[PDB]
Amino acid sequence: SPNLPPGFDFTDPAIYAERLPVAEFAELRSAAPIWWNGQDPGKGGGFHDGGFWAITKLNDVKEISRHSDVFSSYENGVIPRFKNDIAREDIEVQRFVMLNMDAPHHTRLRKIISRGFTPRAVGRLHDELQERAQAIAAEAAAAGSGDFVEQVSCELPLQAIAGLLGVPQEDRGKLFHWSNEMTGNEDPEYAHIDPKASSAELIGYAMKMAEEKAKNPADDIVTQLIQADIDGEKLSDDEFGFFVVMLAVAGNETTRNSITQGMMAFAEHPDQWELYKKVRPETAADEIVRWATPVTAFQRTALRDYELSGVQIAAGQRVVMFYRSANFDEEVFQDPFTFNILRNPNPHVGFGGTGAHYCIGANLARMTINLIFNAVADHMPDLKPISAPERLRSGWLNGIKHWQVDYTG
Ligand code: HEM
Ligand SMILES: CCOC(=O)c1cc2cc(-c3ccncc3)ccc2n1CC1CCCCC1
Numbered sequence: 282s283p284n285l286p287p288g289f290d291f292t293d294p295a296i297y298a299e300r301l302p303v304a305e306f307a308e309l310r311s312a313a314p315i316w317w318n319g320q321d322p323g324k325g326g327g328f329h330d331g332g333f334w335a336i337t338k339l340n341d342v343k344e345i346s347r348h349s350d351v352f353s354s355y356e357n358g359v360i361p362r363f364k365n366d367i368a369r370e371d372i373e374v375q376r377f378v379m380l381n382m383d384a385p386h387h388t389r390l391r392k393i394i395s396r397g398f399t400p401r402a403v404g405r406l407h408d409e410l411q412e413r414a415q416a417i418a419a420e421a422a423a424a425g426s427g428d429f430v431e432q433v434s435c436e437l438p439l440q441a442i443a444g445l446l447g448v449p450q451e452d453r454g455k456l457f458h459w460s461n462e463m464t465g466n467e468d469p470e471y472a473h474i475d476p477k478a479s480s481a482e483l484i485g486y487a488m489k490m491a492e493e494k495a496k497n498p499a500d501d502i503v504t505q506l507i508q509a510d511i512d513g514e515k516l517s518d519d520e521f522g523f524f525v526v527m528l529a530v531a532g533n534e535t536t537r538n539s540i541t542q543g544m545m546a547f548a549e550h551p552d553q554w555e556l557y558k559k560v561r562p563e564t565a566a567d568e569i570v571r572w573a574t575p576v577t578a579f580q581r582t583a584l585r586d587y588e589l590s591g592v593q594i595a596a597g598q599r600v601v602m603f604y605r606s607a608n609f610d611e612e613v614f615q616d617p618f619t620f621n622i623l624r625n626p627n628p629h630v631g632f633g634g635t636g637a638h639y640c641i642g643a644n645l646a647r648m649t650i651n652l653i654f655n656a657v658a659d660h661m662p663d664l665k666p667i668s669a670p671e672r673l674r675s676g677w678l679n680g681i682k683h684w685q686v687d688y689t690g
Contacts, residue, residue, distance in 0.1 A: 283312040291318055291335050291603060292326055292362040294467050297577065298674035306606035309337045315592040318601070326362035326676055327372055333361065333580065333599035334592070339607035339630055341590055345581055345600055346634030352581035352600060354638060355383040361580040361601045362676025364467060371477075378527040380638065387637060393514055394524060397445065397502040398641045403648065406444045411652050413440050418656035422688045426667065429686040430541055433657065435461075438536035441649050442528050447501040452486070459483045460529035468674040470682060480526050487525035491518045528642075534680060535575040536646045539631075540653055541670070541681040543569035548666055550620045557622055558658045565622035566650040571629035572620055574605045577679045579633070604630050605679065661688035 285305060296302050309316050319332035336342055345352045358375040375381040379390045396402075414437050421432040439457045442448075448456055459479040465471040491507050498504045506524070509515045516524060546569065547554040557565055580601045587594045594600060608629045609617040632640035640646070657664070665687050673680030 283308050283316060285309075288321060289318075290320055290324070292333075292578065292601065292676040294362065294674045294676045297676065297679065298468070298672055300672070301577075301605060301679065303605075303609070306337055306603060306609070309335060310606065310610065314338045315341060315590055324365055326365055327367040327369075328357065328361075328599065330597070330599065333601045334594060336600055336602045337606040337610075338590070339610040339613050339628075339634075342602040342604065342607045342630055343634040343636075344589060345602055346630075346636035346638065348587075349384065349581075349637045351584055351587050353383050353584050354381050354387075354581060356582035356584065356597075357580065357599060359579040359581070359638075360677055361578055361599070377523045379524070380527060380531065384637065389514065390516075390520070391637070391641070393506060393510075393516055394641065396505045396510075398645065400644070402445070402502055403645045406441060406645070407648060407652075409444050410437065410441055410649065413437060414649075414652040414656040415659065417653070418660035422661040425689055426685070426687040429544065429684040430537070430681055431683075433544070433653065434537045434540040434681075437653050438533055438540075438646075438649055441536070441645055442532050445502060445645070446490075446525065446528070447503055448490075456483075456486070456529075459486075460533050463526075463530045464534060464678060465673060465675065465680065467676070468682070483526050483529055484519070484522035487522040488518045490525075491516070491521045531640075532642050532646065534678060536649050538575040538678070538680050539570050539573040539646070539650060541684060542573035542575075542679070543650065543654065544657070544664075544686075545666075545670060545681075545684070546572050546620050553620050553622050557654065558662055561651075561655055561658065562622055563647070563651050564625050564627065565654065566647040567627040567629060567631075568620065568622045568624045569650055569654075570631035570646070571608045571624075571627060573679065574608050574629075574631050575679055576631070576633075576677065577605045577675075578603045578677050602630075602634065604633070607634075663690035664688045665690050 314337050316335045317332055318335045355376055358372055358381045379387060417436055439460060443453045443456060459482050462474045462479040463476050466474060466476060490503060494504050495507055506516045507521055578601050580599050583594045583596055583598050585596050608631060611617055613628060632643040667685035667687055670684040671682045673682050
């Protein structure tokens with residue numbers, strides 16, 4: 282029924298290198314909110330099961346996220362697209378990080394790692410991130426023009442991870458280098474990167490950091506993570522290393538692409554940009570995340586038969602939650618295609634559907650976004666784009682590689 286091209290794959294990186302398949306996502310919400318996306322032989326992005334169920338409705342995304350007992354993140358990982366020829370064991374490597382664990386293993390890890398995302402712990406970063414956000418902005422304005430991504434979006438998200446982990450200043454340069462080589466392998470601009478090499482360098486440094494803190498324990502997030510709680514629970518040295526590797530991407534290109542596409546949206550909607558500069562509403566962060574949806578989609582795997590909204594899902598089959606579609610569901614949003622930074626409440630799923638795996642760094646991201654746009658307004662309120670943004674070739678990330686901008690006008 283649904284009017285779609287033969288051979289169409291919603292995880293095809295060819296599409297996302299050009300555009301977002303908004304019209305195609307809308308077609309399914311009307312004609313087939315849960316639609317079997319078949320994949321030709323050898324074109325499964327690393328999965329040889331023949332296709333997956335596209336999930337386009339927000340309520341369906343929420344049901345899958347909260348029914349993590351049926352819909353597993355471990356079985357096949359949550360990334361729904363790699364290079365088609367990727368070895369299976371390269372996919373299973375994901376299972377070493379919390380994102381791709383099921384309960385009970387995931388439950389133990391999440392509980393320990395929560396010590397580093399308490400509201401207090403994130404608040405201690407406000408002043409330092411505000412200071413840097415202002416300086417980044419001032420630095421870019423002085424340049425007159427350049428790559429908005431590298432000059433505005435790139436650094437601060439990484440400074441949040443470093444500050445959260447108490448990484449020494451002199452170490453941050455190489456730490457950022459490694460973190461930025463973790464994803465984007467499919468884009469021709471980054472074909473030469475080896476995410477496996479830089480990850481090993483990341484774990485080696487993180488494990489090194491963990492054994493030093495045990496011998497010289499101070500008050501910071503790293504020490505609380507490697508010390509036994511009242512329950513005797515804590516992160517082993519390697520578990521802390523897989524924690525760092527997870528942050529290096531989970532809080533890197535996600536927050537970055539939200540800053541970029543957030544500024545892109547402000548350029549598209551001058552009314553909203555004048556409004557922001559005057560009142561600086563912090564509800565803008567959630568609207569920027571909904572508008573940007575930096576993670577286009579994560580997948581799950583059904584461990585048993587499951588009926589979801591009148592559609593039979595069979596054990597072993599993959600379901601791909603398309604957050605880019607759920608965040609523009611006409612059923613839950615009044616004018617989903619209206620950029621409204623005052624939108625309140627705003628139940629977007631850019632941080633995922635509520636449930637076990639809901640982004641632990643959601644509020645840190647919100648604060649990063651708010652601090653940097655306040656700085657953009659303070660230091661370059663009349664910036665205008667020079668050329669169209671350059672999109673990233675990815676099957677699940679909605680990335681912006683470059684964006685030329687004039688900060689003077
Ligand atoms: C705009 C910024 C961000 C977006 C769009 C985003 C998106 C997401 C999504 C969709 C998930 C999976 C949710 C699910 O499976 O139900 C997730 C999980 C996660 N995020 Fe984020 N995230 C952002 C920022 C951050 C930051 C700044 C950090 C840390 C510094 C972070 C750390 C994590 C971690 C550790 C997980 C795994 C949680 C688990 O598996 O239990 N994220 N994020
Ligand atoms: C020992 C584990 O370390 C890794 O190898 C690794 C972890 C990881 C996590 C994310 C990630 C993505 C999104 N949201 C949060 C996290 C993306 C890529 C990742 N990789 C590299 C990649 C190399 C080979 C194929 C899969 C893994």
